[PDB]
Amino acid sequence: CIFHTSRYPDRDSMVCHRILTYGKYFETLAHDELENYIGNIRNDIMNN
Amino acid sequence: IKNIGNTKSEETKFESKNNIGIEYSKDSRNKLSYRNKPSIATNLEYKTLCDMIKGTSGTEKEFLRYLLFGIKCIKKGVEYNIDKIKDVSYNDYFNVL
Amino acid sequence: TQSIHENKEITEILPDNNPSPPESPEDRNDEPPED
Amino acid sequence: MNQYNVKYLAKILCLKTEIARDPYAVINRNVLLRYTTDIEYNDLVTLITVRHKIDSMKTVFQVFNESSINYTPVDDDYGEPIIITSYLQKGHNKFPVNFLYIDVVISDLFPSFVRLDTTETNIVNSVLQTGDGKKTLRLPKMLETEIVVKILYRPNIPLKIVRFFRNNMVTGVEIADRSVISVA
Amino acid sequence: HLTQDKATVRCRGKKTKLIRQANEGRKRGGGIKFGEMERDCLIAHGAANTITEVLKDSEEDYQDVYVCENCGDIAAQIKGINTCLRCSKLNLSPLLTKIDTTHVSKVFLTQMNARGVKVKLDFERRPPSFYKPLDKVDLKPSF
Amino acid sequence: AVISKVTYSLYDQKEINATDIIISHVKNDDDIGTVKDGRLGAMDGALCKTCGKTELECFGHWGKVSIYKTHIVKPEFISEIIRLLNHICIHCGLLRSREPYSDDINLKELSGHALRRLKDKILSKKKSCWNSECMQPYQKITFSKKKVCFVNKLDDINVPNSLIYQKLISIHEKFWPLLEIHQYPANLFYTDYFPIPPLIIRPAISFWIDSIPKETNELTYLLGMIVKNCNLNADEQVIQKAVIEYDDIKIISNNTTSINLSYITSGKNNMIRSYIVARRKDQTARSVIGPSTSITVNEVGMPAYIRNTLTEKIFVNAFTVDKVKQLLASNQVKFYFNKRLNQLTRIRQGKFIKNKIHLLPGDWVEVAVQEYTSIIFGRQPSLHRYNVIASSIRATEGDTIKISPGIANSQNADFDGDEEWMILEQNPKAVIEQSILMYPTTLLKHDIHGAPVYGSIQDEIVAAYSLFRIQDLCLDEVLNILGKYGREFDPKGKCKFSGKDIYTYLIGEKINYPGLLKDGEIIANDVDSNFVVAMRHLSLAGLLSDHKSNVEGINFIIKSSYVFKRYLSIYGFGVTFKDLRPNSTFTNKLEAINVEKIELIKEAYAKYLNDVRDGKIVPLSKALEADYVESMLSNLTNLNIREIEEHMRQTLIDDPDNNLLKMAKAGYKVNPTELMYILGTYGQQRIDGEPAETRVLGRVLPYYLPDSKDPEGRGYILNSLTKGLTGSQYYFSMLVARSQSTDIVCETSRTGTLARKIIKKMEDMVVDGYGQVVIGNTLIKYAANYTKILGSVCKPVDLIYPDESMTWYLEISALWNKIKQGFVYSQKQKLAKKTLAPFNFLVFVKPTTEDNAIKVKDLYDMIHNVIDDVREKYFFTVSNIDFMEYIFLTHLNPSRIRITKETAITIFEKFYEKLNYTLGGGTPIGIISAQVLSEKFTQQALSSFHTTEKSGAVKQKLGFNEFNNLTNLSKNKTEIITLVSDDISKLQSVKINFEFVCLGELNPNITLRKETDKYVVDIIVNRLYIKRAEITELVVEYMIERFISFSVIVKEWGMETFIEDEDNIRFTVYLNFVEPEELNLSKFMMVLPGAANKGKISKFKIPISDYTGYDDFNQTKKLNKMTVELMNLKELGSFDLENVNVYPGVWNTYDIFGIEAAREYLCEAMLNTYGEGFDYLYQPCDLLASLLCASYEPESVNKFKFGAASTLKRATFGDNKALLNAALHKKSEPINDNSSCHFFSKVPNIGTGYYKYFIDLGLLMRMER
Amino acid sequence: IGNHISALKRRYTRRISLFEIAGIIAESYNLLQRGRLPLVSEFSDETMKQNMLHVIIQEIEEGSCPIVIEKNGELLSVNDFDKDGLKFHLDYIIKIWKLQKRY
Ligand SMILES: [Mg+2]
Ligand SMILES: [Zn+2]
Ligand SMILES: [Zn+2]
């Protein structure tokens, strides 16, 4: 890519991206909220 | 040709196999402060070099080196004047329509 | 078209289509740093 | 000073000769048609001889670098040395190298200008008054260090207004005026 | 896109509290905004009085307001007497003069004062002038 | 009673203390002593405890809070304090020099240079304290911006504000001018008290729901927070931080959302430019528009729902009292105003007050708006003057606002959903101004180019074209066409009539004009768009207006539009599908032609590629190969164009009544290119002037093989619209379309910003009372339009060069020699064809038969004497008007035409009328010019008028971007320098020494090998590449040798050259590198192709071209030309450029030639940015340039550097710091600018406001009852 | 030579344009609308039955217009301007006013 830049997939090309559908929003939010929940429980136990 | 230089002062688009060297040549830190003279002997069949290699440092030097090139061409048997060489015409390919 | 005083002609510049008027409004470290 | 910029300076030292002959003459490229020049170059002192065709009168200019000045008047001398400086400075006989990279006088961008006499100055001052007491308008400004001011210099005639004959695409020529402001 | 969903008109209505200008909103009976490009056009016509009247407060909202020529404060009215509190506290007797400006100008100036900038206004007292008869002028050519 | 001057400064500490209202508590039972107490002003449902008045009549009062021995810095001026700590010794408090402390020098009798030099010396001292009182080093204090305190850079030690205050207040008055101090350093701090502002600027915040409790104002909350830390007797940091976050939080933080004092002047949403120079209004409306044939250009149709809400005013006076009483009796009055009490009353139906209505002079009543009242209306955006006009009201049906199609073009309006807005202003002065100045009949002729702004559109054009051609009509048919205008038609003795007769009747005037008219009859072959459409140069209404007045022109427009629409009603018009494609013969033929030719082109290209792939020819460069292919494709497109033109001609022969070809002939929207798109081919699609670029496998789409050379694979479309594009062709078409839309959005954003800046800059430039152009107190131009005549009245006319057949040849040649300098321009490659006549005298010219004519001598004397008289009496002997005399001597030359004495007298009487009546003081010429320029470049940007092109040499671009660059006037950028000569050797030297070439460009054959004690590098070059680069073999040798000689990674080297054969050269290099060996070997082999070069690095080559230049109208020469980009001209100083004409950029030309040359350059370049046929824009550009060069140095449009712009003007422009600096410097200014007048509700010094009005009571007081 | 230029400029001051006459009419009309006394000859109760713009034009034409304008450091009444220019502009204004149903 250093020597032939135009022949390497560009950052705006669809070749190098994937797309999120309806269910993926819910999946990611569930992941993040569960992690925050467990973190808060750990912090409370440590403080107690 | 006289000494016209460049410094890190519009955008350019070179082939990137030449751009590396082109941008390397823009840094004054990559050049010696004084010329480094030749040390490996060559062109043993000529004494005009001794005339050119020292003393002559003006238009005479340019004239002498052009003479040397012409002498080499004459010995080889070539035109030695680039203006008198024929360039291939490509209009024969693209004259359709 | 014909030419009469071509050296004094005036060239028209007018868009054909224009935009319609407006309407009232009415950490998991899971992202690249993006340097 | 070098072997090329002296040829450019020789043309400025024909407009200066014309102004010496007549302080109210119009200055532009065409003036050069009435003069001839001879140049003798040397790294220490260059000699420029300006000759008026009809009169055959001579004027001799001696040109020196700023660093080394050794001036002694000669026959038909202009009466003052011509100095080439490294940077712009005040003085009608001092010219920076910046002015002499190209043949300035014959460029299409060289102006056409003249000095106003007393009658024309009075008319201009009268036109500028607003008619309400002594209030007046002001002309646009130009610096004293421009080459135009250097060319139009006389020891005993202060220069306050310069008139320009602008090229105009629809009327041919247009008249404008500027006032000269001093530089400290 | 239906005509009766876009039509609007205002005669009189509510004002905004801070600046006392016509409110905004089609559903709330707001007024159309006279922008500065329209102002440019009016100036290009040469209609000075028209633009002056457009940009001013309504003639029906006028009231007497006095300003102190010394410090620029709006004079208070105590027991029917116009007084500058700041200058009176300093034992001074400055002139109080009537002004006819917009409310938004007063708000802007007061805020600038709050930031520490003092704004003082002077007034023109040109000496009286008299009309004199003038000789006649024709201006026609000689034909 | 007239505000005339404004002064800014800072408050003294004693002034802050002068108040009896002390605030102490953050809370209290009744807010007494709090930041919300009622003594500071009235509030919701509460009278003011100070003056005892309601909110509508109380403007608030000031208070103070106590600070206990805590010195407080004023945030805005924090930086100022830093500036004052670099001129004194902190420890001993003395200046950083000793010269000021000398009695031998008195500063009173000296200023400017002396003070500035002394200040420079004092600042440059910067050394350990000279005096022995303390003998301490000088520190460097700065505001931390994280901790609210000043700290020393050398040592992180907090410096208390008390020390800084004590040191600063010690400076004596006599040294203030040296340090640029005006009032007092102590004015930069608060010491004993802090002010508390009134309640007017911080009323309780409400919401759209009445139930929701009102929330506290942010300013009040911040003031309470300040008060919280005051009585606590805390440190200075807490109070300082509270004050900073109350005033301007951005001083320390970086969030731009909190509300504080500075919010009023934050950004684009200033209080000035949202509520002072703009505002919402009461009597306004807005609605969708539609057309109407019953409304003339002077009128506007108002719907019922608007007529039933808006109201108009009737003033009570002796003339109207009875009418007002009748209206009150009839229940028609909606509002009443008592002027003596300033009281407004609404007359509700069924409920109102009778005794309260006592009508006295000066009162007024308001009733429903009536027909023929003037109203102001327009369509946004308001790009130029004609978007906002005042017209007479007519009652119409529906809920839409109706306009005549005759004004649609001037507003850039159509009827696919557009809306327009209305406002009603009823002040009597405004009424008169609306009735005269803003009336459409007064606006007929465009301000700059003078063509009418109203006319016909669309199918009317075709109607006009057809009407002129109809031949055999009886009287009944003529009268049916003429309709209500047929009453006065005169059938002299004829029984058959033509369309020419109808046109002659419509033009009821016997006038001549070369080309169009002879004795009032059209002598052109046809009537087309240029005769009847707005903004066109052959308008008939324009000639009629020039002959008499705007009333006649408007009448002709109305009447001709009516008759054109009657023609449409009687005969009809419509295009069908059969008009476009009766059968498939022609399209099939053209399709076959395209199919054959494209294959021929592909075969030729394949032959070339195959020959290169073998050893039969050296390949071309990429650029040249692309150029050859492009040439072949362009030839194919031109063949298609020629076929379409032949088809149009043949169809016209066979089917003379084809309606599509009628549209083409009349000059409306149809031409060979559009028909080629429909029936022929689409051609090449381009982005940024080139075909689409390859992206992955050397291709654009996977429909083509890797590294494909098929032109169709890079955007050449073969199909037409009737055939239908394929999917891949559709891709390229949509690429172009979508790029255009995106660019439109971006350009819409940028053009508005530039337009606003230009308008603000030029707003105050007007014509004075003597016909001169002035701004402020500076004379910009002696004669307003070169003529001291209204701009719309002057007329461009042919420039007739001297000829020996003319009558007064000597005088004419002398005048030409006097004025010719400006008629050769654009680097000597253009000759002017037009000049400017004062008023279009041609419509008054009539030939005569050589014996009733005026004698030659008398005519010459008349012209000469008139010109002399006008020269002295109207131009005061200063301006040059030789061009007027030249125009009169050439266009009325007896060898060209003979005229009677009466004709000449009429012409010159009209000349004097134009000189006397048309141009008046107060004309806003600057803003008109700004609007014209801005509207033009905006419309050109939004229509994609300019198309990018690829070039091999340096060129100056067109369009908005270049104009913006010119107005910015940025420094420290490369400029395009043009060199022109007649001897080509001088240019060739510069070319050889400046054009960039590198070894890699020559396609060498570098190889390397290692031998005992050496590395051998062979570089083989083909001579043809050397020849194409336009250099010699020794140039290549020198490049290589110069690179190797100065390399820092080469230890030992040697070179030799060999002639391999008739067409190859081998350069051999023997090398030994420095340690490390192999690493440096790899680096050398990597950088060799690009490092061995000569010339100035740039992306452009330097070809030398030839053209033909003018010396005069009859002298021509052949000139050579080249261009190069440079920072300055120093490098040229040693190249023998004698007799070489040099054209540099703006800053270089200013530095060498002066300010006048810079002005000329700017004017010409700005004009060039617009394109080819826009010469009429010369006058506006000339003004803008003159403004940018009004001082002794050029000045950008982004700044106010040399002009003495007032503080309020700068603040309106968007400075955001102007008021603070003005207060710091104690500036006192007059009130003359438009912005300043708007701020204080004064009448601007524009138009009617340019004069001052008085009333003479003498005659009233001489009358006795 | 200064006096000659001054005299020429004083003569130039007497020419009249649309802005000046429009301003004069606007001032006079505002004053009349708000209730000043008309200054026409033969003033009587029949004067109050006429059109106000007719009254303003009559005052201008018979030389009793009370408005005074300051132009180039001088104070001019409407009758100090060039007569033909005043007639020219008034004719145009009356035409367009008639088109508007005002006059
Ligand atoms: Mg539309
Ligand atoms: Zn006060
Ligand atoms: Zn109060």
Ligand SMILES: [Zn+2]
């Ligand atoms: Zn010290």
